[PDB]
A paper describes a structure:
pmcVoltage-gated sodium (NaV) channels initiate and propagate action potentials in nerves and muscles, and mutations in NaV channels lead to many diseases of hyperexcitability. Structural studies of the homotetrameric bacterial sodium channel NaVAb showed that these four homologous domains come together to form a functional channel with an ion-conducting pore at its center. To overcome these limitations, we introduced these IEM mutations into NaVAb, a bacterial ancestor of mammalian NaV channels, confirmed their functional effects in negatively shifting the voltage dependence of channel activation, and determined their structures at high resolution by X-ray crystallography. All of these structures have their VSs in the activated state, as determined by the outward position of the gating charges in the S4 segment, while the PM is closed at the activation gate formed by the intracellular ends of the S6 segments.
NaVAb/Leu123 is analogous to Ile848 in DII of NaV1.7, which is conservatively replaced by Leu in the other three domains of NaV1.7. Electrophysiological recordings of NaVAb/L123T show a shift of −15.5 mV in Va, similar to negative shifts in Va of −13.8 mV to −7.5 mV in previous studies of NaV1.7/I848T. The structure of NaVAb/L123T in the activated state at 2.7-Å resolution indicates that the substituted Thr side chain forms a hydrogen bond with the highly conserved Asn211 side chain in the S6 segment of a neighboring subunit (referred to as Asn211′). Asn211 is a conserved residue that is important for electromechanical coupling and critical for the gating process by bridging interactions between the S4-S5 linker and the S6 activation gate. In the WT structure, Asn211′ forms part of the wall of the ion-conducting pore with its side chain pointing toward the lumen, while also interacting with Val126 in the S4-S5 linker. In the L123T structure, the Asn211′ side chain adopts a different rotamer that points away from the lumen of the pore toward the S4-S5 linker and forms a hydrogen bond with a distance of ~3.1 Å to the hydroxyl oxygen of the L123T side chain. The hydrogen bond formed between these two residues from the S4-S5 linker and the S6′ segment would provide additional stabilization of the activated state and therefore significantly shift voltage-dependent activation to more negative membrane potentials. In contrast, the native Leu side chain in the NaVAb resting state makes an additional hydrophobic interaction with the conserved Phe207’ residue located one helical turn from Asn211′. This interaction is absent in the L123T structure as the length of the side chain is reduced by the mutation, suggesting destabilization of the resting state by this mutation. Therefore, the loss of the hydrophobic interaction in the resting state and the gain of a hydrogen bond in the activated state both likely contribute to the large negative shift in Va.
Residue numbers in the entry:
A (entry chain A), B (entry chain A), C (entry chain A), D (entry chain A): 999 to 1238
Amino acid sequence: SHMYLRITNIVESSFFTKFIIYLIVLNGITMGLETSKTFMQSFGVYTTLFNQIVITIFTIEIILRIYVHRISFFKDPWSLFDFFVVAISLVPTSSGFEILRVLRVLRLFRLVTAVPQMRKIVSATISVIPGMLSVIALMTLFFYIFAIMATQLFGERFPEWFGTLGESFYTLFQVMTLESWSMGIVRPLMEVYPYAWVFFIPFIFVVTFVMINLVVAIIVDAMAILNQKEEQHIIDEVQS
Amino acid sequence: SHMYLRITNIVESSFFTKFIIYLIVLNGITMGLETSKTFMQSFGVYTTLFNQIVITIFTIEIILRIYVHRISFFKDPWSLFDFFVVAISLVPTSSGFEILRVLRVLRLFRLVTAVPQMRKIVSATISVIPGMLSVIALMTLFFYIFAIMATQLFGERFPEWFGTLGESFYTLFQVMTLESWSMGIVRPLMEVYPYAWVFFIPFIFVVTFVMINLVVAIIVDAMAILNQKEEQHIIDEVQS
Amino acid sequence: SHMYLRITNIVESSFFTKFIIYLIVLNGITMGLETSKTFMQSFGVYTTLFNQIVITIFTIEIILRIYVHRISFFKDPWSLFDFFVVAISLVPTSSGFEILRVLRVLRLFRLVTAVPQMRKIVSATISVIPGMLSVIALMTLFFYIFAIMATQLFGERFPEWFGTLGESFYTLFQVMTLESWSMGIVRPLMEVYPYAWVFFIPFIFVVTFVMINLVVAIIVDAMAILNQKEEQHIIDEVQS
Amino acid sequence: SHMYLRITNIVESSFFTKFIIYLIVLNGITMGLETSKTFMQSFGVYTTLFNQIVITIFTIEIILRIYVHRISFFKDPWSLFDFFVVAISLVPTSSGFEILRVLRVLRLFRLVTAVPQMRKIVSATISVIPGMLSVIALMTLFFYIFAIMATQLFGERFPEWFGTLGESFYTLFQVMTLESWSMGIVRPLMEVYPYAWVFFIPFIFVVTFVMINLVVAIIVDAMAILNQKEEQHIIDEVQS
Ligand SMILES: CCCCCCCCCCCCCC(=O)OC[C@H](COP(=O)(O)OCC[N+](C)(C)C)OC(=O)CCCCCCCCCCCCC
Ligand SMILES: CCCCCCCCCCCCCC(=O)OC[C@H](COP(=O)(O)OCC[N+](C)(C)C)OC(=O)CCCCCCCCCCCCC
Ligand SMILES: CCCCCCCCCCCCCC(=O)OC[C@H](COP(=O)(O)OCC[N+](C)(C)C)OC(=O)CCCCCCCCCCCCC
Ligand SMILES: CCCCCCCCCCCCCC(=O)OC[C@H](COP(=O)(O)OCC[N+](C)(C)C)OC(=O)CCCCCCCCCCCCC
Ligand SMILES: CCCCCCCCCCCCCC(=O)OC[C@H](COP(=O)(O)OCC[N+](C)(C)C)OC(=O)CCCCCCCCCCCCC
Ligand SMILES: CCCCCCCCCCCCCC(=O)OC[C@H](COP(=O)(O)OCC[N+](C)(C)C)OC(=O)CCCCCCCCCCCCC
Ligand SMILES: CCCCCCCCCCCCCC(=O)OC[C@H](COP(=O)(O)OCC[N+](C)(C)C)OC(=O)CCCCCCCCCCCCC
Ligand SMILES: CCCCCCCCCCCCCC(=O)OC[C@H](COP(=O)(O)OCC[N+](C)(C)C)OC(=O)CCCCCCCCCCCCC
């Protein structure tokens, strides 16, 4: 169309994306400065104004991008993100609760969706997850079973660490990271339950063994593929 | 046979295994809910009844599976597991001791033996163990020798950490994870035994060096095999 | 030239570099001895004299090397280093501030730039950095966004850990290393902000997931290259 | 010879080595039992007698092995070990100091030198060290320089952690393991030296970066070799 293609050339323009990026880095520096009560005392009204300025400009940009991109926009996770991040930034400050005033900062993550060198890393990193889903499932089932057992064995005398299923989940994650697992948790438990080490040490083994096996399997299964491609390429040349 | 083959078609049926799985996930949600004293106050008799219901249904299922599978059942580790897990769930609640009431929760692990996507992970993970057996042996002998030495050097002034061979084992495992090894253990020791760092730092080196070498050897010995298969496949095509 | 080539033969001589190295190891032993107040009480004037002796000899050496090497000297990072390290050692002790008296010790790092077996390690190690620059950028942006969020959510009640953007950076690095992350930080926070675990646990996941992915990608992308070289070498022989 | 070859057939016999191993496992169980004051009260004279029994039998065995093996014995590290371990076990209990009574336990390590499945692991593990020697050198030089700097910056106000070069070495190793590095060390320092984080965080980076690079280089340099062998094997078949 003609009215359509006018917009589409702006949105798709390098000036557009850059101008957005410069806003982001500008609002980024602003949100770090808003951290200083000294600064907010002096210049606090400027950056509050600079904020919705950026908010609306981002709202407009989001709208245009939807007009240009159509349904392809709501099937693009980076666009979907930019949508919700700017959406969050839109519910009213006063009428809301404080937690939404803080989530405003997530708009700074647009610097990731904008800069393509950044998307690729996030994609690389996230790419390995879908193969781990069954492992994540198993690990969670594991935590679950042990959290139920812990809550029953230790919650009555140790409510802070194990009084509820949720609390026991948390402590077991703590033990998985090994943070103060022994001086902070098991040694105290053992003053009342001498055999507690029979619970947590195997827990520490399974959790540790599994995670390591995950990394070895990721590394070693990848090179098997590299060898598969290499093998066939070399086999082809032999074959002609 | 005819009486035999009637059963065998049910046990081997997809409806069967699914129905078991649905029970498991149902008893799983029940065992998490039984964690709440609020819930047990209100609905506590329902889930206690739902429990032996599931217990007997699992008992029956275990029996049928033995009739169908014969001696092949007691040579299958997944079946052997499901056996003992359901067995444990069968000794009486009142007459027993509390620890068996908790082991009941292990039946939730049937969701692993049932779901084949899960078995494969556990098999993958456990597969690497038999090659490590001599390394596990060496590490244990190592802990053993050092536990005897620690108990003798430090148990008299530090009975909580080193009074007995069992306690010294435990502290040495703690030091292996590095959890509070220095502020919590060696620094206190050194107020009385200034040279204690000569004991634990080499301990921290050997233990650490060995474990890392275990992971490198696992990764690197695997790709040697991948290269062996690849080499011969490629060598064959060259050979014809 | 003739005056030039006289010097150039000394600087480039094996005796030269060795003599410098022997000074370095000598000043190294001296700087460790200067650590003892007993020793400084007895022999403190000797090593203070031995110090500027070495300082000037290193100054002279640096000058000669610049005469010999010309502009190639200021394009060589090892020389540039040796320059600034000896430069630092030159500002006056009395008139300065204590921190420059300590930076004097960095001259001991010349033993690295001197010994070529050492340079190669540092080069190997530093070689992998330029590919990580965008990952370092992303991680820093990440810390930044979360530091702003933390300062806002937790600084008012927890000023030591989160009162300022700088402090929150520091605590988040602490949490990244996992050092006392739960007993020391999140558990205290949760007495006032029960949902704080929703902040730090995802933080602990992203940070951990990313770093691991960095190591796997480094290992696995390298062997892809090794396979590329190997593939073509083998493909060539097939091709003739 | 004839007197020689009589002995040589015993020493080299499978019965010999086994009999030694059975002693070792027997003295091993004895040294764990000697740990119990209950047991030493009851059966303490038996195991003290069983001890020099084993000591002399091991002395004799060591002698025979030297007669049989000649100078080849003192060029064999496993034999050299068994020598010194049994030697240590020989200096007198009463006249000595307690530390030699404890080193007696090292004889249990003969179970490693005896069992060949064990030697191979220790050899594998130790095999990777000689390539790391220059890296170990660099890391130690690094600790050294930073230990001198720490002692000067922080020893006067923090003598326990940094009063001497030896103490600062120890704390820096603690920081390398990250054990309580921040709550236990840097945070206290920063109450007096706000910029202390500029010292330890880069320290934590270098130390961490180097060690990781060591593991990646070990893994990745090994597969380069595997590819080299594979490449030439495959290239040969192409060549005929
Ligand atoms: C090897 C790779 C995988 C490694 C991880 C395996 C999965 C296990 C992760 C567990 C994480 C810890 C969860 C946690 O913090 O538990 C707390 C929550 C909420 O209970 P709540 O009582 O509100 O929290 C404690 C509140 N308190 C202390 C102030 C009274 O307790 C709950 O009710 C939450 C339980 C569900 C958590 C689901 C996590 C799924 C995995 C996350 C996705 C991973 C993708 C990479
Ligand atoms: C065998 C496989 C089965 C899979 C089942 C997965 C789903 C499990 C659902 C059951 C959740 C049970 C939660 C529960 O009992 O909550 C306990 C507490 C509340 O305790 P309560 O005493 O009710 O608090 C009273 C509070 N008052 C006085 C103010 C009224 O609240 C909490 O502690 C927080 C709730 C924690 C939920 C953790 C969810 C873990 C998901 C695991 C997923 C496994 C995937 C394979
Ligand atoms: C690099 C890979 C391998 C890494 C691990 C190497 C093997 C060493 C693991 C040692 C684990 C720690 C053992 C432990 O907790 O020791 C405590 C037990 C029981 O003594 P007890 O006095 O009852 O416990 C202390 C009681 N207290 C403090 C309340 C007075 O002390 C004992 O008497 C138990 C001693 C035998 C433990 C056997 C462990 C064998 C390895 C486990 C299988 C690994 C398969 C992956
Ligand atoms: C050179 C290779 C030799 C291999 C030998 C392996 C087997 C070792 C068996 C010897 C175990 C000795 C155990 C021992 O002495 O127990 C000490 C304490 C009990 O102290 P005690 O003073 O008797 O307690 C009195 C209690 N009272 C007052 C109520 C009567 O009880 C404890 O502290 C718990 C017992 C700890 C046992 C740890 C087992 C480690 C196995 C290492 C396997 C190495 C494989 C290569
Ligand atoms: C996976 C690989 C990458 C892993 C690391 C990712 C990057 C994040 C590293 C963050 C390091 C922690 C920074 C830190 O210590 O923050 C403190 C500083 C100074 O603020 P200040 O308020 O002076 O410090 C606290 C003072 N106090 C507590 C006594 C009141 O706060 C600041 O203002 C400093 C903020 C900028 C730090 C820039 C770091 C860039 C990365 C370093 C280069 C890496 C090359 C390998
Ligand atoms: C979306 C991407 C945007 C990228 C922007 C990167 C640059 C950010 C610049 C903004 C820095 C804001 C610093 C700031 O607000 O400082 C707060 C505090 C000072 O608080 P204040 O209350 O002013 O202290 C008063 C002291 N008195 C009473 C003696 C006068 O001072 C501190 O806490 C120390 C300053 C911390 C600086 C941390 C720098 C992080 C760099 C991140 C780089 C990201 C790269 C992609
Ligand atoms: C990435 C791979 C390599 C990783 C390690 C790199 C090398 C650095 C390791 C440093 C280990 C820590 C040394 C240590 O504990 O320092 C203490 C000693 C003795 O000083 P002292 O004042 O007696 O000890 C403190 C006594 N106090 C607290 C009770 C008053 O201080 C000293 O004077 C000892 C200084 C020399 C230690 C030499 C260590 C060389 C490396 C070990 C061999 C590695 C082979 C795998
Ligand atoms: C640039 C490369 C140069 C390489 C040089 C390597 C060798 C260094 C030798 C210098 C060692 C200096 C040791 C030193 O000053 O000791 C300080 C303290 C003793 O303090 P002090 O105040 O004398 O104690 C008086 C005690 N009283 C009252 C009872 C008489 O004693 C201690 O704190 C313990 C001694 C610590 C020694 C640490 C050795 C590290 C070796 C690093 C190897 C690097 C290899 C590349």
